[PDB]
Design a protein around this ligand. Structure first.
Ligand SMILES: Cc1ncc(COP(=O)(O)O)c(CNC2(C(=O)O)CC2)c1O
Ligand SMILES: Cc1ncc(COP(=O)(O)O)c(CNC2(C(=O)O)CC2)c1O
Lengths: 325, 325
């Protein structure tokens, strides 16, 4: 925790869901190949549930929630959505209820398989992949509010200014430990909170490190414009200026949830050469978009890849992955 | 790292696969329920593969295979083996080839999926019996080796004297990262290689921390003879004497791999109350026993439960689980 950042987060009521600072490891092989030293930060060992990037976010969201006397959080995401599970399982630990408004092929495997095991409540609605279940969440929060039950709705991937503070803290932690001075930091980009917080923070530490987000789906206008808005409201939350938005390379292969022989080979590669697993929906496309850039000489000499968990995907869509190797 | 265990481990050739000390957290919700303080050591976040108690042993094993110049590493295990997967991958990471002599269903899930995904070679001998799948392992080596190739065979669960130094070193770490004094430390016992070294390190350390393993499988015979003989052939290696035995309780619920309704429940509870996931064949069973004994005060006021991993089996069997809740 960096002096300044601490000082700026200390006002926000957060729930402490993590005990240790997750490790930053160096990857010998992917460095020899690609040709750059790439370090990986195990945010997938954040510990709660299947771990991952969300846990850090839940700390400021559910921290908040347990304030506004909420007693039943709602969230959204894919049916395989890690965040959805982790937000759910987390909701329950802090002694709260949780309703997941999922969307997709009802498959009893992966995170949806977990969702049940843990008994988290599940509600699916075949609807515009635009993640517009975000409206089903509300009707749901309305009627529950019409019962005197105080809910708490969470935005796709905790893409909330307050959940954003999640990585804003993660940058301070990356600064207390890092022995390496990074030129760029990669990380998949789903809803934009990881890039936001990570960016709001860097800017706060005013570090000459480049915030590189590896888009993994939509992008059009929304993903980059809305990205900027998000990181704006966040700063206005911390009451500070912005130091020009990050980078954002699309490596989604066209559509979210697409599993290609490239997202697939890079899985077996990182796994069989470094001994770390990444998934075919998030982390796998971003490590793949890590090699691409590090070979085109676009990342610098020292690069840190923030592993964001998602371990359930590799099991969920393990069948496709096979038919591709 | 306690100075005594540091000196005693000094001369043994290891391969550093673990960059940090795994965190120890207090489980308040489960502690307020069994009437005892229960602390969980997160060894399920060791780093390699799906993490687990095995990565530790693999530091010494693979540093035994290497010191001998091998090109193919062999090991056995049930098709759902956490050891067998993690062994090969790890072997593959050290640039060593790996062949797994599994036994059981060719189902495509759990660690069988991960195996094929990460392209580890696999020989599923329908010889569904016990560990006499080791005679098949050694004969594959005879053929293999009458061709310059230098195979290296690792016992079931990598439970060999020097693979046992993995947790000897573990108590050594524990003994330090902890500002608590436990009455007992519990760890699942399958092939018993973990419980084997744990007893060693607590024997050398010498406080009154009891080694408490809860058998996950039909608490066999060779098992009790094997267990002792492991513990001491290693005491001889460090040249230390074996204080006196470890405690072993049967909680197999009938047999190795039996998923009963109490196992499913212990996963739901720990999952939705502590935010930690256990599997149905190993850790879920071990923690179930830890409770059952702490309730009756049989395990002290301060218990340390080592989470040895196994997360794969929870996806591998999340259907049986579902038909139990
Ligand atoms: C493994 C993993 N890596 C990166 C991301 C990034 O999300 P953000 O862009 O919102 O930070 C997710 C997203 N997950 C979401 C989900 O629905 O599961 C969007 C939240 C992720 O799960
Ligand atoms: C998750 C998990 N927890 C505990 C154990 C304990 O093994 P030991 O008692 O032999 O040390 C294993 C075993 N696994 C084996 C496998 O077949 O994978 C026997 C090695 C385990 O996988």
């Amino acid at each position: 925790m960096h002096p300044k950042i601490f000082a700026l987060l200390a006002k926000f009521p957060r729930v402490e869901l993590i005990p240790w600072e997750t490790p930053i490891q160096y990857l010998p092989n992917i460095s020899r190949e690609i040709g750059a030293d790439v370090y990986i930060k195990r945010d997938d060992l954040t510990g709660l549930g299947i771990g991952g990037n969300k846990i850090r976010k839940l700390e400021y969201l559910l921290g908040d929630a347990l304030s506004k006397g909420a007693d039943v959080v709602i969230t959204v995401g894919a049916v395989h959505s890690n965040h959805a599970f982790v937000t759910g399982l987390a909701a329950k630990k802090l002694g709260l209820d949780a309703i997941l408004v999922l969307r997709g092929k009802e498959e009893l495997k992966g995170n949806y398989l977990l969702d049940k095991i843990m008994g988290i409540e599940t509600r699916v609605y075949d609807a515009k992949d635009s993640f517009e279940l975000m409206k089903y969440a509300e009707e749901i929060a309305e009627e529950l509010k019409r019962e005197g039950r105080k809910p708490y709705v969470i935005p796709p991937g905790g893409a909330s200014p307050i959940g954003t503070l999640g990585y804003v803290r993660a940058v301070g932690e990356i600064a207390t430990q890092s022995e390496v001075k990074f030129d760029s930091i990669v990380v998949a980009a789903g809803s934009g909170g990881t890039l936001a917080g990570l960016s709001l923070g860097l800017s706060i530490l005013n570090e000459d490190i480049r915030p590189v987000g590896i888009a993994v789906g939509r992008f059009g206008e929304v993903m980059t414009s809305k990205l900027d808005n998000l990181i704006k409201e966040a700063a206005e939350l911390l009451g500070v200026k912005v130091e020009v938005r990050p980078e954002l390379y699309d490596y989604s292969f066209g559509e979210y949830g697409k599993i290609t022989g490239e997202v697939a080979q890079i899985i077996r590669k990182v796994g069989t050469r470094e001994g770390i697993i990444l998934d075919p929906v998030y982390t796998g496309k971003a490590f793949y978009g890590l090699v691409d850039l590090a070979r085109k000489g676009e990342l610098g000499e020292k690069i840190l890849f923030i592993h964001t968990g998602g371990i359930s995907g590799t099991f969920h869509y393990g069948d496709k992955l096979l038919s591709l190797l």
